[PDB]
Amino acid sequence: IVGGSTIQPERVDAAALRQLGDAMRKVVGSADPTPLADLLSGTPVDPDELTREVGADGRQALLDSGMAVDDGTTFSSPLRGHQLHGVVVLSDPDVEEEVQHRWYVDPLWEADLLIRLMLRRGGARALDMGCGSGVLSLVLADRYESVLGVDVNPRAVALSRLNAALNGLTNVTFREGDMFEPAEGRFSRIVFNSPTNEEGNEFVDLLEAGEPILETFFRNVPRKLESGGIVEVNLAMNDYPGDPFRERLADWLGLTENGLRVQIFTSQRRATESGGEWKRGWLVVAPGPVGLTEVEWPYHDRYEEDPDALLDGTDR
Numbered sequence: 498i499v500g501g502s503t504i505q506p507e508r509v510d511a512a513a514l515r516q517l518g519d520a521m522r523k524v525v526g527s528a529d530p531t532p533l534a535d536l537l538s539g540t541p542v543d544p545d546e547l548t549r550e551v552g553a554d555g556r557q558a559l560l561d562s563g564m565a566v567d568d569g570t571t572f573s574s575p576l577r578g579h580q581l582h583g584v585v586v587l588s589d590p591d592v593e594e595e596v597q598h599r600w601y602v603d604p605l606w607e608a609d610l611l612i613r614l615m616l617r618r619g620g621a622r623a624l625d626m627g628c629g630s631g632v633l634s635l636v637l638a639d640r641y642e643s644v645l646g647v648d649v650n651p652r653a654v655a656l657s658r659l660n661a662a663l664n665g666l667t668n669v670t671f672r673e674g675d676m677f678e679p680a681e682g683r684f685s686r687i688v689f690n691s692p693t694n695e696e697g698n699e700f701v702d703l704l705e706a707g708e709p710i711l712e713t714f715f716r717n718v719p720r721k722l723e724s725g726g727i728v729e730v731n732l733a734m735n736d737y738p739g740d741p742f743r744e745r746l747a748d749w750l751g752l753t754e755n756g757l758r759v760q761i762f763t764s765q766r767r768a769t770e771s772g773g774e775w776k777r778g779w780l781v782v783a784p785g786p787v788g789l790t791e792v793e794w795p796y797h798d799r800y801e802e803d804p805d806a807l808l809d810g811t812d813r
């Protein structure tokens with residue numbers, strides 16, 4: 498069972514974590530792994546080998562935070578390391594449903610693609626809804642004065658905090674709660690990698706929560722959004738016969754009443770049982786002429802042929 502491990506950044510000095518992050522930056526994601534990079538790739542490691550790379554203090558920091566577990570003879574990590582877009586991130590290893598804990602954290606399935614779709618501009622205050630590992634928040638922290646990440650999974654909140662400390666980031670905060678409840682005030686930027694995929698209307702789990710989580714999100718967005726703010730959402734959308742997602746969305750957003758502009762970029766689609774249609778896409782709320790537009794953008798395809806330059810893309 499994966500994703501129930503205890504994560505406790507609060508039990509380590511901020512400096513020790515910052516140094517560990519420095520060490521990880523040198524090796525995570527690079528060829529010829531050192532013992533630290535081996536540890537964070539899921540390989541058990543002799544602790545004296547770690548000692549020479551992170552110090553005995555670093556070694557004790559790894560234990561105290563929950564990043565490492567002492568199997569007597571060796572150390573092992575329940576987490577896996579990533580490095581991308583200027584940040585080091587720990588998350589759960591990519592494993593199948595049957596062995597996931599209820600607090601399993603998104604193992605960065607779509608993060609790198611999503612970061613590349615995001616408008617490159619920065620601003621005053623950003624919100625990362627369902628922050629998971631915290632990866633989107635950490636990237637946003639570089640160009641926002643402050644960033645709040647929220648999740649209902651307490652373990653995601655702890656991991657997010659740890660990941661911010663590892664990167665020595667000071668302007669990013671994380672709170673446990675349900676949707677917007679722990680997010681006070683308005684935001685000039687809201688990003689939401691939604692937990693929607695194949696489940697349609699039905700709650701399966703925190704990573705497939707059903708369409709209602711989008712309804713809640715979009716019904717409340719208008720009161721959480723600063724004038725001129727931007728909203729970006731990864732989501733799965735179900736068009737049913739005589740019942741397109743986009744009409745439900747416009748209803749939720751009070752589109753004309755609140756005077757918002759929404760663009761939906763569809764990347765993938767398939768026919769469904771109903772004679773309806775499933776789609777995956779990227780939704781953007783941004784200042785301009787009121788209304789809703791649908792465009793095609795096979796960014797998943799383009800990401801596969803050449804990741805390194807979708808790019809963005811939406812700025813257009």
Ligand SMILES: Nc1ncnc2c1ncn2[C@@H]1O[C@H](CSCC[C@H](N)C(=O)O)[C@@H](O)[C@H]1O
Pocket residue numbers: 602603604605606607608626627628629630631632633647648649650653674675676690691692703704706710
């Ligand atoms: N009611 C709710 N309130 C806040 N977050 C929720 C929620 N229901 C599900 N979530 C969270 O939404 C996230 C979706 S996965 C997104 C994770 C992260 N932003 C990434 O891009 O990798 C999960 O972390 C899940 O725990």
